[PDB]
Swiss-Prot record, chain A:
Bias (Pro residues): 29-41
Family: Belongs to the eukaryotic RPA34 RNA polymerase subunit family.
Other facts: It is in an antisense orientation to and overlaps the gene of the DNA repair enzyme ERCC1. This gene overlap is conserved in mouse, suggesting an important biological function.
Region ranges (Disordered): 18-41
Range covered out of full length: 103 to 153 of 510
Disulfide pattern: none
Species of provenance: Homo sapiens (Human)
Protein known as: DNA-directed RNA polymerase I subunit RPA34
Residues that bear Phosphoserine: 26, 34
Compartments (UniProt record): Nucleus, Nucleolus; Chromosome
Highest taxon above the source species: Eukaryota
Entry function: Component of RNA polymerase I (Pol I), a DNA-dependent RNA polymerase which synthesizes ribosomal RNA precursors using the four ribonucleoside triphosphates as substrates. Involved in UBTF-activated transcription, presumably at a step following PIC formation.
Quaternary structure note: Component of the RNA polymerase I (Pol I) complex consisting of 13 subunits: a ten-subunit catalytic core composed of POLR1A/RPA1, POLR1B/RPA2, POLR1C/RPAC1, POLR1D/RPAC2, POLR1H/RPA12, POLR2E/RPABC1, POLR2F/RPABC2, POLR2H/RPABC3, POLR2K/RPABC4 and POLR2L/RPABC5; a mobile stalk subunit POLR1F/RPA43 protruding from the core and additional subunits homologous to general transcription factors POLR1E/RPA49 and POLR1G/RPA34. Forms a heterodimer with POLR1E/RPA49. Part of Pol I pre-initiation complex (PIC), in which Pol I core assembles with RRN3 and promoter-bound UTBF and SL1/TIF-IB complex.
Swiss-Prot record, chain B:
Subunit structure: Component of the RNA polymerase I (Pol I) complex consisting of 13 subunits: a ten-subunit catalytic core composed of POLR1A/RPA1, POLR1B/RPA2, POLR1C/RPAC1, POLR1D/RPAC2, POLR1H/RPA12, POLR2E/RPABC1, POLR2F/RPABC2, POLR2H/RPABC3, POLR2K/RPABC4 and POLR2L/RPABC5; a mobile stalk subunit POLR1F/RPA43 protruding from the core and additional subunits homologous to general transcription factors POLR1E/RPA49 and POLR1G/RPA34. Part of Pol I pre-initiation complex (PIC), in which Pol I core assembles with RRN3 and promoter-bound UTBF and SL1/TIF-IB complex.
Family: Belongs to the RNA polymerase beta chain family.
Subcellular location: Nucleus, Nucleolus; Chromosome
Name of the gene: POLR1B
Name assigned to this protein: DNA-directed RNA polymerase I subunit RPA2
Shown stretch of the complete protein: 947 to 1009 of 1135
Primary role: Catalytic core component of RNA polymerase I (Pol I), a DNA-dependent RNA polymerase which synthesizes ribosomal RNA precursors using the four ribonucleoside triphosphates as substrates. Transcribes 47S pre-rRNAs from multicopy rRNA gene clusters, giving rise to 5.8S, 18S and 28S ribosomal RNAs. Pol I-mediated transcription cycle proceeds through transcription initiation, transcription elongation and transcription termination stages.
Annotated disease: Treacher Collins syndrome 4: A form of Treacher Collins syndrome, a disorder of craniofacial development. Treacher Collins syndrome is characterized by a combination of bilateral downward slanting of the palpebral fissures, colobomas of the lower eyelids with a paucity of eyelashes medial to the defect, hypoplasia of the facial bones, cleft palate, malformation of the external ears, atresia of the external auditory canals, and bilateral conductive hearing loss. TCS4 inheritance pattern is autosomal dominant.
Free-text domain note: The active site comprises the fork loops, the loops and the rudder that stabilize the transcription bubble and assist polymerase translocation.
């Protein structure tokens, strides 16, 4: 009436919960790159010679 | 003057020389001076500009 060893298991199942990968879009930056410093339009000379 | 904003293609000297030439000065930043001692226009045109100087805390009055 006691507990005895039974037949060895024939296989093992290991369960884990996993989600999946999306598409590669690689959206690097809101406003991207190093935007260049640049000329103010027209500007004009702010200096003249004497005479 | 942020580092790494001006490349080989877009140079800093090109940019600021265009800025200067747009004000009536010359591209390369050289304006020609006179000698305040002899009164003659020196043969070489000088490189003049505006730079930010700091004054250090080490004075001959303390050393």
């Amino acid at each position: 009436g006691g507990l005895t060893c039974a037949s060895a298991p024939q296989g093992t199942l290991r369960i884990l919960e996993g989600p999946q990968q999306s598409l590669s879009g690689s959206p690097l930056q809101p406003i991207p790159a190093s935007p260049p410093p640049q000329i103010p339009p027209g500007l004009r000379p702010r200096f003249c010679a004497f005479g | 003057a942020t580092p790494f904003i001006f490349s080989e293609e877009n140079s800093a000297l090109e940019y600021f020389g265009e800025m200067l030439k747009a004000a009536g000065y010359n591209f390369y930043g050289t304006e020609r001076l006179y000698s305040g001692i002899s009164g003659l226009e020196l043969e070489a045109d000088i490189f003049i500009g505006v730079v930010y100087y700091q004054r250090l805390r080490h004075m001959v009055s303390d050393k």
